[PDB]
Amino acid sequence: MNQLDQLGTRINLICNVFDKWIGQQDLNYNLFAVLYTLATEGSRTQKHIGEKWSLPKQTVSGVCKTLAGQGLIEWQEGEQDRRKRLLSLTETGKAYAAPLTESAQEFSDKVFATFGDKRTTRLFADLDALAEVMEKTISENK
Amino acid sequence: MNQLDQLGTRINLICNVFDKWIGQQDLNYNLFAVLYTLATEGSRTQKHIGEKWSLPKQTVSGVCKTLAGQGLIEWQEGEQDRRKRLLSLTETGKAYAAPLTESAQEFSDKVFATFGDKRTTRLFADLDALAEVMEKTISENK
C-alpha cells in the first residue's frame, strides 16, 4: 500500500502500545502527561505540558484540576493567571511519581536495548523531520 | 532526556498531525479508517478495518451504521451477522471516497518526497522493532 497508509497504521499501533504501558502504571495518557513531565523536567506550565504531549489546553486544565484537588500538584504564586504560572509536584506528588519514573526508566532500558544512542538520536531527528514536513504541507493547504 | 520520553512525545506528535490532516478533509480518524480502507483495499470486514487502524469493534460498528444509513457503504448478504460479513463501498460511496484517496495520495507524495524511501523503510523497521519489544515487555510485566 501507500506510504502514508503504512505510516498511519504503524504510528497508531505504537501510540496504542505506549498507552497500554501507561495503563499498566495505573494511569491514563492525560494523567501521565502531567505527572511524568513534572517529575522528569521539574516545574513546567500547562501550556508546555500540553505542547509536549500533543494535548489541547482543556485536557491539561482538566487533569490539573483533579491532581491539584488530590493535593499532588500546586501552582507557584504570582500575578499572572493561574494557567500561566508554573506547576510543580507537591511532596506527596514527588512520592507518588517516584515509582513511575523508576518503572519508566526500566521499561526504557529493556525497550531500547537493541538501539544505540546514535541510532535513537537519528530516529528522534527522523520523527521530528517527519512531523515538520507534515505540518508544513498541512499549513500550505490551509 | 529519557529515551522513552523522547519516543512517547514524538510518536504522539505524528499521530496528532496525521489526525489533523484527516480533519482537514472534514473527517475524523474513525470515518477515515472505514472509508479509506474500503476505497484502497476493496471489500473488508469490520474486524480487518478495526485491526488495521487499531480501533475497538464498537467504534467501528458505530461508524459503519452511520455510513450505511447515508447509503455510502453496504454489507454483502449472508447467513452470518453483518459484523463478520464483507463491507463494500456503494457506487455513491466510491464517488464520495474519490477526493479523499486523491488528497491522501497527494499528501503521501508531498511528505515522502522530502523524507525519502530508504529513510522511510528505516523509520518503519525501527517503529516495528520498538512496538515489538514494548508489546513483549508489557506482556512479561503481567
Residues A44 and A86 in one domain: yes
Same domain, A19 and A74: no
Domain at A17, CATH number: 1.20.5.220
Strands A87-89 and A73-75: antiparallel
Do B47 and B61 lie in a common domain? yes
Which residue shows C-alpha cell 521499561? A107
Same domain, yes or no: B31 and B81: yes
The answer to whether residues B86 and B35 belong to one domain is yes
Answer whether A24 sits within 8 Å of B135, measured CB to CB.
Answer: no
Which of A65, A3, A70, A81 shows the shortest CA–CA distance to B106?
A: A3
Shared domain for A99 and A132, answered yes or no, is yes
B102 shares its domain with B137? yes
B3-23 helix and B29-41 helix, angle to the nearest 10 degrees: 80
* A120 at interface of B, judged by CB pairs closer than 8 A: yes
CA distance B79 to chain A (A): 31
Q: Supply φ then ψ for residue B74, to 5 degrees.
A: -160, 145
Q: What pairs with residue B75 in β-bridges?
A: B87
Cβ within 8 Å, pair A120-B3? yes
Closest Cα in chain B to A14: B131
Q: How many CB atoms lie within 10 A of CB A81?
A: 8
Q: Which residues of B37-68 are buried (b: 16+ CB within 10 A; e: fewer)?
A: bbbbeeebbbeebbebbbbeeeebeebbeebb
CA dist., res. B18 & res. B38, Å (int)? 19
Domain boundary among B66, B90, B114: B90
Torsion angle, alpha carbons of B86, B131, A6, B20, to 10: 90
Kindly state whether B18 is in contact with chain A, defined as any CB-CB distance less than 8 angstroms. yes
Same domain as B59, residue B43 = yes
CB contact under 8 A, A1 and B138: no
| Number of structural domains in chain B | 3
Within 8 A of A59 by CB-CB distance, chain B residues are none
CB-CB contact of B4 with A111 (8 Å): yes
The answer on A40 and A60 residing in a single domain is yes
For A9, the closest of B13, B53, B108 (CB atoms) is B53
Are B85 and B32 within one domain? yes
B50, B72, B90 - which closes a domain = B90
Which of B90, B111, B126 lies at the terminal end of a domain, its last residue? B90
Q: Under an 8 A CB cutoff, do B126 and A119 touch?
A: yes
| Distances in whole angstroms, Cα of residue B26 to Cα of each of A8, A58, B29, B48, B72 | 18, 22, 10, 24, 16
Nearest CA to A72 out of A84, A90, A53, A55 is that of A90
Q: Are B71 and B95 part of one and the same domain?
A: no
Q: What is the CATH number of the domain that holds B118?
A: 6.10.250.820
The whole domain housing A99 covers: 91-142
Same domain, A103 and A127: yes
Phi and psi (nearest 5°) for B70? -90, 5
The experimental resolution of this structure, in angstroms, equals 2.1
Method: X-ray
Q: What CATH code is carried by the domain that includes residue B36? A: 1.10.10.10
> In 3D, which of A80, A97, A92 has the Cα closest to residue A37?
A97
Determine the residue type at A123: L
Q: B38 and B87 in contact (C-beta within 8 Å)?
A: yes
